[PDB]
Amino acid sequence: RIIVVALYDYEAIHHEDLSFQKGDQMVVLEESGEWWKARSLATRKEGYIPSNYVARVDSLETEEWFFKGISRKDAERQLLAPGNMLGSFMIRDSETTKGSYSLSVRDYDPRQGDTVKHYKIRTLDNGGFYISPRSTFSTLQELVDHYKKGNDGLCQKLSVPCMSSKPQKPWEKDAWEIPRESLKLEKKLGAGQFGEVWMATYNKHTKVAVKTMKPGSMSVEAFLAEANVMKTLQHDKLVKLHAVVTKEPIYIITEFMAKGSLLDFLKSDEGSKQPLPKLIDFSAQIAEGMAFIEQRNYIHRDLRAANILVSASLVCKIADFGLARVIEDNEYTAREGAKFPIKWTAPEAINFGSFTIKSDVWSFGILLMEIVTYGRIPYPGMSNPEVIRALERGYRMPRPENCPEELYNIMMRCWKNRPEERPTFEYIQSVLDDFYTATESQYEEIP
Numbered sequence: 001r002i003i004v005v006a007l008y009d010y011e012a013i014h015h016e017d018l019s020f021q022k023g024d025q026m027v028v029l030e031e032s033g034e035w036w037k038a039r040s041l042a043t044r045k046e047g048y049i050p051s052n053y054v055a056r057v058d059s060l061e062t063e064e065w066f067f068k069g070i071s072r073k074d075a076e077r078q079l080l081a082p083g084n085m086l087g088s089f090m091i092r093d094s095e096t097t098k099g100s101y102s103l104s105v106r107d108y109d110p111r112q113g114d115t116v117k118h119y120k121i122r123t124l125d126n127g128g129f130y131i132s133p134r135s136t137f138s139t140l141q142e143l144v145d146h147y148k149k150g151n152d153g154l155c156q157k158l159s160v161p162c163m164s165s166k167p168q169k170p171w172e173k174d175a176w177e178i179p180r181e182s183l184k185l186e187k188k189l190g191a192g193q194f195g196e197v198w199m200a201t202y203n204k205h206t207k208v209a210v211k212t213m214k215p216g217s218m219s220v221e222a223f224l225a226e227a228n229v230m231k232t233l234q235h236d237k238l239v240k241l242h243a244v245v246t247k248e249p250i251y252i253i254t255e256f257m258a259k260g261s262l263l264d265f266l267k268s269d270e271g272s273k274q275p276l277p278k279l280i281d282f283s284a285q286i287a288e289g290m291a292f293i294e295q296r297n298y299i300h301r302d303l304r305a306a307n308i309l310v311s312a313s314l315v316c317k318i319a320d321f322g323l324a325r326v327i328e329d330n331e332y333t334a335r336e337g338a339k340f341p342i343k344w345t346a347p348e349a350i351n352f353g354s355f356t357i358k359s360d361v362w363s364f365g366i367l368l369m370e371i372v373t374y375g376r377i378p379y380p381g382m383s384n385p386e387v388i389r390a391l392e393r394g395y396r397m398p399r400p401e402n403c404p405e406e407l408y409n410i411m412m413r414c415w416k417n418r419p420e421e422r423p424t425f426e427y428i429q430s431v432l433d434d435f436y437t438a439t440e441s442q443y444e445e446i447p
């Protein structure tokens, strides 16, 4: 026997779904991918429900202030999002002390501006919790209520939990290779060299994006082999692949991203006004996604601002990872022009076709420059031959205006001519994540 409790509002979208509002009764039979075999016994309608819409009985996932599955950096971003107030907070699983917890609180001071402070919540050997030894609690709820009444040493009195939206409903079960008829293409988002992108509706009920590859551009078996790897690369900073139409012309169905590519966004009224620390946060988000790709021994092959997507809430999500590998070179694709852009591509990839995570690192440096210049072409004023010959002689794009020197230093490391001398994405992720909070305490040492 195993019991769970609902969290959000969701009713049937498919056939054998259930209905619940503001948390109802659930009895999970056994698990699956993202859907769980649910037993209601209250509405007595039985079938499947989204596993991320429910919470286990005994645990903290029911609490409005608890955020399971998120990182320290995630916590900082979520709290600093517009809509949160001074003292907004969350409790999360500790990233550096397994089994214990961390409290993250939105702070403000005139010197540093908007910040997030983190506190270690220690667990007592025989039960209960504390941040400061003089103030212990039987439960985390008691801890929260205590610091809601006064700061008692914290940077701020706790106000309200960090804001959050209901999670995206999981993709339809066993709907990986889907019929073309399941898709209504509603709005063309852009033409492209080897395919178009559409906003579309899947089976009348779900908004998606569809990349529609041009005839002749890919074959079914080669694409599917790769797509079956792509779909497993799941990470908050990679765009999610939902489904594919595995008949020519091949369709790739993904989550829809409201603000288009990062290049589009940086060139828009809204995006051109993002301040430098937000640009650096975008850079960090992408580095986090590329560190994941690196950890998974994968290769992007075409990293650039046009292949980063931006969500309605300004989350960056890497797109087109691995796609270049399965675009065919034949008479049909040749008429669409150059396959990869010289100005973004590492010299060893151009010269010897050596595409690796290190050639992605080179490209990431070019992408950093795109970001800090709000989408300017790389190497302005230079032709492609000029770029290649300049690079061979140690020329690199000079530091532009409004670019922190340490960000430029990261670019220069990415652009080492020898791939082995380029940093890892793990390294880049660390430096960008900590860009402004370097030489600071991880946690606040409360009295």
Ligand SMILES: CC(C)C[C@H](N[C@H]1CC[C@H](n2cc(-c3ccc(Oc4ccccc4)cc3)c3c(N)ncnc32)CC1)C(=O)N(C)C
Pocket (backbone or CB within 6 Å): 189, 190, 191, 192, 197, 209, 210, 211, 230, 239, 241, 252, 253, 254, 255, 256, 257, 258, 259, 260, 261, 264, 306, 309, 318, 319, 320, 321, 322, 323
């Ligand atoms: C101002 C724009 C009109 C200019 C336009 N910009 C584009 C930028 C990109 C936009 N674009 C592209 C995608 C996208 C969809 C599927 C996909 O498939 C894969 C995903 C992962 C791994 C493998 C394949 C990749 C990207 C996408 C999206 N899911 N949601 C919103 N916009 C999107 C569509 C608009 C452009 O570049 N043109 C050449 C016209």
